[PDB]
Curated annotation (Swiss-Prot), chain A:
Organism: Thermus thermophilus (strain ATCC 27634 / DSM 579 / HB8)
Protein name: V-type ATP synthase subunit C
Described function: Produces ATP from ADP in the presence of a proton gradient across the membrane.
A single GO molecular function term of this UniProt record: ATP binding
GO BP annotation list: proton motive force-driven plasma membrane ATP synthesis
UniProt GO cellular component terms: proton-transporting V-type ATPase, V0 domain
This protein's encoding gene: atpC
InterPro entries, A to Z: ATPase_csu/dsu_sf, ATPase_V0-cplx_csu, ATPase_V0-cplx_csu/dsu, V-ATPase_V0D/AC39_subunit, V-type_ATPase_csu/dsu, V-type_ATPase_csu/dsu_dom_3
Highest classification ranks of the organism: Bacteria, Thermotogati, Deinococcota, Deinococci, Thermales
Record keywords: ATP synthesis, Hydrogen ion transport, Ion transport, Transport
Length: 320, 73, 649, 73, 73, 73, 73, 73, 73, 73, 73, 73, 73, 73
């Protein structure tokens, strides 16, 4: 469809979202009080009861509807660019489907988090537990990550090799589709996200010892292959040298919680920086990122209230 | 007549030809958006059709200019 | 002049190698190599080596950070010889005195920023505070009233005190704080509604926040008094400390960089089973440097400048240009581009010959040359003085060495440019109205110029032919160099392809100029048939699908040299038109405001000449790089660069 | 004859062709979105067909104006 | 004689058609944006017409110029 | 011949060309978009033809108008 | 007026029509962005309208040129 | 000479050129999408060829009309 | 007079119209981005004046040239 | 007369050039898709070549028509 | 100077108008990107204004060419 | 003594210009895709050139037609 | 005489203006990407303006042809 | 050549202008992609500027045809 006509509806829906002060002042309400405050929020129609389980389930339903119902008058040609954003949820669903099928886990035991692929098709692919069968049951033309899956599916049948090829190949295919996309904002955001994911995987894999050519994700807009190899190695100075990009926050730190906090904050501050390009997919990306951040912060605050904890003990959970 | 007797005809034909581009522009986008949002916007299906039929004013004005030229010749 | 350098394989004791590396780093005339798989381990670093390396790395990082904190820049200077711990004991006082003072200054700045944000509003809130809010049978909500929307919030907070007063606007609207007071200390109910609508309480940080109205205001006034003086003292102390410690920090940083580089080199070495070995490369002209350095390690097991490797599978060969001094300043053009692969012809020296002639020919204006010389004199101050050439306008990080090279390049070009300005009869574009000194055919004022004004009646064809011929010569030279390098590299197919491309170009040009061009196609029919047959033979030798459109595009590029003639003619015409128009509106228009008209014409001419000279500099170099250089390579392929160890100074 | 008949014919034909161009421009996007929705599912197929046949008016109007011009020729 | 009438007819009609095309241009993008916004929220489904109807001003001015031209003939 | 016949033939050509451009414009977006849906729906050839049959309307009319112009010439 | 007035009107009409086309070209994107902004938050709808009324300045200049041409023709 | 044969040839050339432009406009997008689907699945080439058989019709019509006009010249 | 004045007027009209078309083309993107930034923040209420006023230069130059031509005519 | 021969040359050249433009338009997106398929896998490139062989038909048709016209002239 | 002067003025005006159209075409994208970067920050506005005011060279050269033609009109 | 060489020259020039336009149209997308492919992988420059040089067939055909017309001249 | 003078002047102006338009067309995208990258990092200022000044050579050919025509006036 | 000379000059100017338009059309996209990739990696400026400046062959050939026309007249 039209990236501008869809941009209008996206602007309306993204203006129909909770604000920073709502989370700031709703942190005092606890248990049922916080549940009712959420019931007053944008996701308010979902909120039924009180407590962390129901709060999380309602937040999941609200996300799966509001952000999971993208193709309304945006599908068609622009669909192949919009779906590129919705990657991780479908990736987790498909990797879980492959692991469960190759490990004997029940089909109904798999959560099948809604995303790019249909949950009914995922349940079918549970029967189609073969690699090629799952690829066929997930061959979405508008999600060329299906191609990387089939190539991974055709790469082998062993679960470990299939998954290890699938993750990296799908990340590379998504990055390449973004590179070939006629959208500067989308290309920039996706490349910076790939670089940040490489840095985070290096930090969480510091000392893992895998070959940097494989472990260090390609397409780095922050750290090259050698720079990520050094980050995996004992080079904390790599973090300080990684300054000058939007990811300039790193400074001699091998930490992981702070790394996640900073990466989330920087990616949010970048995805919110495209507001000046409404006709482009920048509005769609801002809406998606804001919906995800609000959902995460709301679920964290709900758990904190249902278990008597402060939500903002880590600022990474406040609104980001 | 002589030069006028076909020059005015060409002037009206070019009038209509350049006018129809207005509809060709507007209606493509309007119809695409309406078809995209119709299945989810039954609350505006009539409104979508109204918005789609809105740009006929330019075609009407062009037909009016054509008729005025035909009367002038 | 890409010298092939030489190899310097060497061996020594596992102990003496640690001093041999220091000697070689002092004599920084060699780049190293790996040699790790030489049937031995690659000199596994000692744990003591790792500890000393960590200490030195911390010392260097601290030196850089302290330079930043003091404000200075990490300028490599005369080092500061000392022990590792001695230099640590030098850096630690500077590090502490800098970090503490910086924390103090940042704290004072943030405190002052809060004070400006809170002093006057706190005073206004205190004035609005008639009674004490701490009275337990009462409480207040001090909503900030920079905006007068508080009456709207009064809708929700209609609750009012039994005694007096309620939530409304407050005095000193810039720092107004609402007097939303509620009895029984129950003002939280009102605060809920005032958070729902309107504005929140005029909160404050720190003492201004924790303390009540009176103590908070006293602390705020004390901070308002102190923070000016605090920041001033902190700034003065930090400035004096930076001034005192800059030289020591720079010397320490230099020594640390040298030592750390030596240690890292040692880490890169290869072991010798109670011995050790070294390897790498050094220029053939630096064989004397290697021989000289071989004396300190007088043992010098293999310290001899063994020959460089042969071309067969030697991709590791490091490259270095070192153009002759006449061509040395003009190395920047090839510096701003790719690098060869150890055996291609270096075209950088050809640039200061070929480029200036064409550039001046297109730039053939005497007034333009005078302006260029004036601008050169203007920049020569900093250029000779080694002043800061870096310009923050367009992120220009220029250094005086760049100025030194560029001044030579500009003067060399400007000589030919002034020569072409005299030849083409352009003086300030065209001063013919004042004097046709560059004698025009209509009415000379002095020595005639061969092409002047409307001389393009034949000069157009002349210049077009000359440009096409110069481009043909350059393209033929490039193709010949390509074929010769392919032959010298035993790339028989590449050499044959280049030769056939040249022959096909010759035959195509012959056929065009004969059949479609002028007469006398008899002595040229053989040439055209030979060229077409040579292209066919090249195709046959290259087997199937050796695209002839490549040679066709090459011929097009050869024709593209006429762009130089076109640009020169257009620039001359534009300059003459501008100068004549200015002289007409200045002197011919009564000659009363002749100076004003001439100055306006010159200013506009310079504004145009900005982009004109931009093109006159890019388009010739553009043609060079696009056609001539790309004919063979150096726009493709790459190789290892040189890197002389240490010698930081 | 001379300088009236062919000019009238061209004035009619160019106008008719440009009206066809505008109609095609609209129909491209409208029918593209509609066909995408129909292939996805056959729920609103009737509405899609209606919204896709709707843009056929401009070609008819231009052809009628061309026929009137041909009569006036 | 024949030159004046034909020249006036063409110079009016072609201008009017071009103005209609120009108006239909904006009637594509702004119309599609309004459709998308009203579909998402059927609350500005009337307030969007306030800016949707704006581009007709150029068509009106061009029609006035063409009407003056026609009155001159 | 002369002016009338040649100008009428050129006007017929212009009509045919503009109508063909409109037909191609209509075909472009819909035929391109339906390809991927047909790929995901390899058995939807009926709904593919349901859209692919549409563009012929302009071609048929252009051919008929060209034949009429040829007869009038 | 003949060869003076008819061609003068033709030139004035070409200028006015192209000015209208440019104004509409600006207005398309300007109005789309304004509609999106107002729908997202109608807090600066007045400012958006004030800014989106701008593209007509060139149309006004072209109308002034056409008026000068009419006065001198 | 004759002022009819040259006019007929020029009109036929214009018609053929516009038809080719429309055919290419359709063919670019349609064939690109079809080739994408066929590279996704080699089975899709069977329908991709059917799709690619469509853009040739406009060129066929533009050649036929040109031949007819050239003969009737 | 006659042909000379008519050609002068037509040339002036074409010049002014092309200048206005270019100015509107620039203003399209400039004002779209300006409205986007205004929605993003009130910072666009300031320095956007230069961006929105730069398009007027082309129309101003075209109008000046047209006025000079009219004075010389 | 002699100029009636140059009219045929103009027609043939315009037809050939416009057919070339149509072929290049049909070739742009096809070549982009082919480059993508090749950068993905050579197995896609084998069928991509047969997919990319399409655009030359318009050029061939235009060249044949121009050759027939030139031979007649 | 009826034909020479008037047609020289017409050619100069058309050249200046085409140059203005090209300058506006450049300025559109340049100003759009510059507005995006300015909304990002006003710090890079020093280089941004240079990049957004530099393309005026084409319009300046077109105006100079028109002035030269007027001098030789 | 008339204008036949001028007509032949105009025909050849228009043919060349249109062929260049078509070549650029194909080249934009083809070269962009090739640049992307080469940036992603340096082991496909041969295929990149193979795809990029293909649209030169239209330029070669245009050159052949121009040479034939020049020879006829 | 103006029969050659005007047909030389406008003939030069056409080439000059169209070359200017092409140069502006290239400069649009080139300068937009350059400004964006310069805002991303000041290190792209020169490395971008270098590649971005390449389109400025386009208008030079038109200026040269115009100068040649002015000489041959 | 009088009228023949003017027609030849106009043909040459149109040839140069259209070739410049096509070259710039290709160059904008190719150069934008190259600028992006070179900003991504400074070692890509080798192939970047190569592929950017490569397509100028059409412009060179058009200038050659213009020179041939100038020599013939």
């Amino acid at each position: 469809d039209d990236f501008a006509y869809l941009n209008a509806r996206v602007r309306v829906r993204r203006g129909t979202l909770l604000k920073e002060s709502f989370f700031q002042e709703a942190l005092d309400l606890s248990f049922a009080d916080f549940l009712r405050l959420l019931s007053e929020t944008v996701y308010g129609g979902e909120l039924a009861g009180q407590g962390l389980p129901d709060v999380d389930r309602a937040v999941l339903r609200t996300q799966a509807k509001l952000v999971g119902d993208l193709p309304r008058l945006v599908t068609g040609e622009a669909r192949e660019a919009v779906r590129l954003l919705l990657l991780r949820n479908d990736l987790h669903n498909l990797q879980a489907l492959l692991r469960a099928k190759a490990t004997g886990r029940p089909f109904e035991e798999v959560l099948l988090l809604p995303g790019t692929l249909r949950e009914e098709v995922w349940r079918q692919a549970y029967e189609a537990q073969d690699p090629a069968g799952m690829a066929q049951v997930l061959a979405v033309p508008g999600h060329p990550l299906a191609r990387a899956l089939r190539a991974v599916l055709r790469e082998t049948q062993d679960l470990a090799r299939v998954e290890a090829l699938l993750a990296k190949r799908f990340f590379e295919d998504v990055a390449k589709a973004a590179k070939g996309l006629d959208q500067p904002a989308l290309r920039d955001y996706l490349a910076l996200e790939v670089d940040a994911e490489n840095l985070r995987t290096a930090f969480k894999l510091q000392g893992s010892g895998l070959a940097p050519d494989a472990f260090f994700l390609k397409g780095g807009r922050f750290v090259d292959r050698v720079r990520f190899a050094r980050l995996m190695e004992g080079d904390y100075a790599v973090l300080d040298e990684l300054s000058g990009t939007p990811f300039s926050g790193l400074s001699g730190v091998r930490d992981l919680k702070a790394l996640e906090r900073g990466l989330r904050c920087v990616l949010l501050k970048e995805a919110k920086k495209g507001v000046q390009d409404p006709l482009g997919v920048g509005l769609v990306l801002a809406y998606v990122k804001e919906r995800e951040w609000e959902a995460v912060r709301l679920r964290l605050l709900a758990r904190r209230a249902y278990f008597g904890l402060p939500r903002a003990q880590v600022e990474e959970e406040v609104v980001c | 007549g002589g030069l006028d007797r076909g020059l005015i005809a060409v002037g009206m034909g070019l009038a209509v030809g350049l006018a129809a581009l207005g509809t060709g522009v507007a209606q493509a986008r309007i119809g695409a958006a309406g078809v995209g949002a119709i299945a989810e916007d039954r609350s505006n299906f009539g409104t979508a059709l109204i918005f789609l039929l809105l740009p006929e004013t330019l075609v009407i004005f062009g037909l009016l200019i054509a008729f005025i030229l035909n009367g002038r010749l | 002049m890409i010298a092939p350098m030489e190899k310097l394989v060497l061996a020594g004791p596992k102990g003496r190698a640690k001093e041999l590396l220091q000697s070689l780093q002092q004599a920084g005339v060699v780049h190293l190599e790996t040699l790790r798989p030489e049937a031995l381990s690659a000199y596994q670093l000692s744990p003591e080596e790792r500890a000393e390396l960590r200490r030195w790395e911390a010392v260097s990082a601290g030196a850089e950070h302290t330079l930043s904190l003091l404000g200075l820049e990490a300028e490599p200077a005369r080092p500061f010889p000392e022990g590792l711990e001695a230099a640590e004991k030098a850096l630690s006082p500077i590090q502490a005195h800098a970090e503490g003072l910086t924390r103090q200054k940042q704290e004072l700045e943030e405190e002052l920023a809060l004070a400006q944000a809170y002093l006057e509003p706190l005073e206004r809130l205190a004035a609005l505070a008639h009674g004490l809010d701490k009275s337990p049978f009462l409480r207040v909500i001090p909503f900030l009233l920079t905006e007068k929307e508080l009456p709207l919030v009064e809708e929700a907070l209609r609750k009012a005190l039994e005694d007096r007063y309620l939530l409304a606007h407050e005095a000193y609207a810039g720092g107004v704080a609402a007097l939303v007071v509620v009895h029984r200390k129950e003002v939280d109910q009102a605060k809920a509604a005032l958070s729902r609508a309107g504005v929140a309480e005029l909160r404050l940080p720190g003492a201004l926040g924790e303390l009540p109205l009176s103590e908070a205001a006293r602390r705020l006034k004390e901070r308002a008094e102190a923070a000016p003086r605090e920041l001033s003292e902190v700034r003065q102390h930090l400035a004096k400390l930076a001034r005192e410690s800059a030289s020591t920090l720079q010397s320490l940083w230099t020594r640390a960089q040298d030592e750390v580089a030596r240690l890292k080199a040692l880490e890169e070495l290869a072991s010798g089973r109670f011995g050790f070995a070294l390897l790498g490369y050094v220029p053939v002209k630096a064989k004397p440097k290697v021989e000289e350095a071989l004396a300190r390690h007088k043992e010098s097991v293999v310290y001899a400048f063994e020959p460089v490797d042969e071309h067969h599978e030697a991709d590791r060969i490091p490259v270095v240009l070192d153009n002759p001094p006449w061509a040395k300043p003009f190395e920047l053009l090839v510096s701003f581009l790719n690098t060869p692969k150890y055996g291609t012809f270096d075209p950088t020296p050809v640039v200061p010959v070929f480029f200036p002639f064409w550039f001046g020919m297109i730039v053939g204006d005497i007034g333009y040359a005078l302006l260029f010389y004036l601008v050169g004199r203007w920049l020569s101050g900093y250029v000779k003085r080694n002043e800061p050439l870096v310009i923050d306008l367009f992120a220009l990080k220029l250094k005086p060495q760049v100025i030194g090279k560029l001044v030579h390049i500009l003067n060399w070009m400007v000589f030919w440019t002034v020569v072409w300005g005299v030849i083409y009869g352009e003086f300030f574009g065209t001063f013919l109205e004042h004097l046709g000194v560059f004698g025009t055919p209509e009415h000379p004022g002095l020595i005639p110029i061969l092409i002047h004004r409307i001389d393009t009646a034949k000069t157009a064809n002349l210049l077009i032919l000359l440009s096409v011929a110069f481009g043909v010569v350059l393209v033929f030279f490039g193709l010949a160099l390509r074929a010769y390098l392919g032959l010298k590299h035993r790339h028989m197919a590449h050499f044959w392809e280049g030769v056939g491309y040249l022959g096909g170009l010759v035959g195509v040009l012959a056929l065009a100029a004969s059949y479609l061009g002028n007469l006398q196609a008899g002595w040229l029919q053989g040439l055209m048939y030979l060229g077409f047959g040579v292209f066919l033979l090249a195709v046959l030798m290259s087997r199937i699908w050796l695209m002839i459109p490549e040679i066709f595009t090459q011929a097009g590029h050869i024709l593209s040299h006429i762009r130089i003639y076109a640009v020169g003619a257009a620039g001359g015409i534009l300059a003459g038109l501008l100068t004549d128009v200015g002289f007409a509106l200045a002197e011919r228009l009564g000659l009363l405001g002749v100076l004003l008209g001439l100055l306006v014409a010159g200013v506009l001419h310079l504004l145009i000449l900005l982009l004109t000279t931009l093109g006159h500099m890019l388009q010739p170099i553009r043609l060079l790089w696009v056609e001539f250089f790309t004919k063979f390579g150096f726009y493709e392929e790459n190789g290892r660069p040189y890197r002389p160890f240490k010698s930081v100074r």
